[PDB]
Structure 1
Amino acid sequence: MKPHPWFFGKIPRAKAEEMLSKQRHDGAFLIRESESAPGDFSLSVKFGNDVQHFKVLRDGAGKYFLWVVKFNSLNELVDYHRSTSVSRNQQIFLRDIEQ
């Protein structure tokens, strides 16, 4: 198969912002491993000229989520948010980076 082009591993928050601020399309994102919280994943995404950061949460049942809908994998969370906004105030749909 093909590996996922959105997983960037352990990269700083500032480095994700520098990279995403240079993307052209709204929704360009990456998943990175948080340095502030070891073991947590951070979803960094571009909207307008800004770069917003979302913490990938895990509930008591071990399911991943951003708000209320629960997923069995990061892969499913990411794919679901290609057509459902990651934000409750803005319409930010995840779309792959131009590598």
Structure 2
Amino acid sequence: SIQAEEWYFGKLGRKDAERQLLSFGNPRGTFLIRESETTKGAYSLSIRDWDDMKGDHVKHYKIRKLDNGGYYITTRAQFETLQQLVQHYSERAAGLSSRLVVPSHK
């Protein structure tokens, strides 16, 4: 039961993530997570980034996972779980445009 309410929602896709952040949720710099329906069932890291020239928006970072145990959105860095990686990304982005949720859903 990771944060289940900050940088990870559960088994969501990229369509619900884009309308989940823009449709009442948080400002930019908010990176949530969710299971990617692109592969058998990988993970994901949606992001919120509004702009002063079009409106709000939302990107995504498909998260992968080593069979040996290594959660990594980019092969440059993996971890043991999503709570442990949200722990490391909490202090750093890891390489993506922005790190996990910046503010606090609270």
1: distance between equivalents of 2:49 and 2:91? 15
Specify which structure has the higher proportion of strand: 1
1:78-97: CA deviation from partner (whole Å, max 9, x where unpaired): 12112212545x3x132256
Identity value in percent = 30
Q: Where in structure 2 are the equivalents of 1:1-99 lying within 5 Å?
A: 4=3, 5-6=5-6, 7-22=8-23, 23-48=25-50, 49-59=56-66, 61-67=68-74, 68-88=76-96, 90=97, 92-95=98-101, 98=105
User: For structure 1, which runs of at least 5 residues remain unmatched after alignment?
Assistant: none
Which TM-score applies when normalising by structure 2? Answer: 0.69
Measure how far apart 1:72 and its partner are: 1.0
Which TM-score applies when normalising by structure 1? Answer: 0.73
3-state secondary structure, aligned to 1:58: strand
Runs of at least 4 residues of structure 1 off by over 4 A?
none
Q: Give the root-mean-square deviation of aligned CA atoms.
A: 2.6
Measure how far apart 1:44 and its partner are: 0.5
Q: How many residues align structurally?
A: 96
1: distance between equivalents of 2:47 and 2:94? 9
